[PDB]
């Protein structure tokens, strides 16, 4: 049903039944690339002390860097110099390891994601891929796009000077909806000295169930938006009448 | 040939002997003493550098910096006992994060 | 004066291809001066306690068996004995 092909198809600019009317991206792209990074100095040697199994793999071979892996507990992926080489299981973002998920329509609020098969807890779903904005263009993007009539806005505050924007291009995680009783959460993971956001299951998700996370949203614009999920204790309004940033 | 060659040592038996005599350790010093002491100091130097070179190679490095000496000395229980009251400049410490601190 | 050149020459036996930094050399230099004083000061006491007048190989040997831990002591004592054996030949 997804049918990711380079030829764009017939849709009324909503990306709902055919994700190829607009343009889509498979990983996070940058606008103002920095030569002032953490990677070459700080993360260079902070690898886990997990002894590499040298002959026990694929059969009676336990996975390298499981929940005993300190880097995993610290929300850091092992670097290219991990002692386990390419057998490390804590290099999921780097390996493009995703979960089986589908994009469907459920409520008048918009499109969403569902798990295609059985998923245990603490299972990595998808990376929040998008355009990384600077201090100057974020405040320009926000004031210029409101008058372009965009229905949804996909700005996420990553750091004091890193803001992800999935508005023009984004992977399949741009569709995960807000839930007050979610089954996934947004975790900050550091990969090779780069900060990245990943979705992880918080409970047992049955085959064919909708995937949602707690949107830790704020309202930056002059306009007011409301949520229609209404599970059991839905707040409904973004941030009250606040004026932050 | 020097006394070092007769002892089969790299260390300066001449200097050790001179320092034992000049350093007031006794009113006179036996000829076997500077040889035995030189061999001991040389041996501990080799044991220290063996372990520091290993620590460097275990980091895939080719040069022994102070940290490799600290890692070497602290990873062996006997040298750790001998040098347990010694601060090493630029040495740092072993990670040793306590289990009750990990989630 | 420093033991630096002999430390560097000793390093090439155990690790022929590795180098050592100036600070690390300063550490090895301090370490040799320290253990030298620990053994020589202990040998001085051993002689004085026995009212002897000279530091013999026996005094060094005991100052070592006292100062060094159990397994290291046996190795150091072996290298000291072997060195005096060759030197007396």
């Amino acid at each position: 049903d997804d049918f990711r092909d380079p030829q764009r198809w017939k849709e009324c600019a909503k990306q709902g039944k055919m994700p190829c009317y607009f343009d889509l991206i498979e990983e996070n792209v940058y606008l103002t690339e920095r030569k002032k990074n953490k990677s070459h100095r700080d993360i260079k040697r902070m690898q886990c002390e997990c002894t590499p199994l040298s002959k026990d793999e694929r059969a009676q071979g336990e996975i390298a860097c499981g929940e005993d892996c300190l880097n995993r507990l610290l929300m850091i992926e092992c670097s290219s110099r991990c002692p386990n080489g390419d057998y490390c299981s804590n290099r999921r973002f780097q390996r493009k390891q995703h979960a089986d998920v589908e994009v469907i329509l459920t409520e008048k609020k918009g499109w969403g994601l569902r798990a295609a098969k059985d998923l245990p807890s603490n299972t990595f779903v998808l990376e929040y891929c998008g355009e990384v904005l600077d201090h100057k263009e974020f405040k320009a993007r926000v004031k210029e796009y409101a008058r372009n009539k965009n229905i949804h806005y996909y700005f996420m505050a990553l750091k004091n000077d890193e803001i992800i924007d999935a508005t023009q291009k984004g992977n399949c995680s741009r569709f995960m909806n807000h839930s007050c009783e979610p089954n996934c959460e947004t975790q900050k993971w550091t990969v090779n000295g780069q900060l990245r956001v990943g979705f992880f299951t918080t409970k047992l998700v049955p085959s064919g169930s909708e995937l949602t996370f707690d949107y830790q949203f704020q309202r930056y614009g002059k306009e007011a938006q409301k949520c229609f999920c209404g599970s059991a204790n839905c707040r409904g309004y973004l941030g009250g009448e606040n004026r932050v940033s | 040939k020097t006394r070092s060659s007769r002892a089969g040592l790299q260390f300066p038996v001449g200097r050790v002997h001179r320092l034992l005599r000049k350093g007031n350790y006794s009113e006179r010093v036996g000829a076997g003493a500077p040889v035995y002491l030189a061999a001991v100091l040389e041996y501990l130097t080799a044991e220290i550098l063996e372990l520091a070179g290993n620590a460097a190679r275990d980091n895939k490095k080719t040069r022994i910096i102070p940290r490799h000496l600290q890692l070497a000395i602290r990873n062996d229980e006997e040298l750790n006992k001998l040098l347990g009251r010694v601060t090493i400049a630029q040495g740092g410490v072993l990670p040793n994060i306590q289990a009750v601190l990990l989630p | 004066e420093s033991y630096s050149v002999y430390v560097y020459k000793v390093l090439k036996q155990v690790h022929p291809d590795t180098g050592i930094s100036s600070k690390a050399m300063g550490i090895m230099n301090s370490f040799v001066n320290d253990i030298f004083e620990r053994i020589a000061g202990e040998a001085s006491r051993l002689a004085h306690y026995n009212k002897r007048s000279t530091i013999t190989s026996r005094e060094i040997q005991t100052a070592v068996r006292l100062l060094l831990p159990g397994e290291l002591a046996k190795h150091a004592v072996s290298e000291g004995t072997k060195a005096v054996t060759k030197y007396t030949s």
Partner: peptide
């Protein structure tokens, strides 16, 4: 294929015998 910042090594030069 990947290497660390040389500044790490500049702060501590090799022993010079001369």
């Amino acid at each position: 294929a990947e290497e660390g910042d040389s500044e790490s090594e500049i702060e501590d030069e090799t022993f010079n015998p001369s």
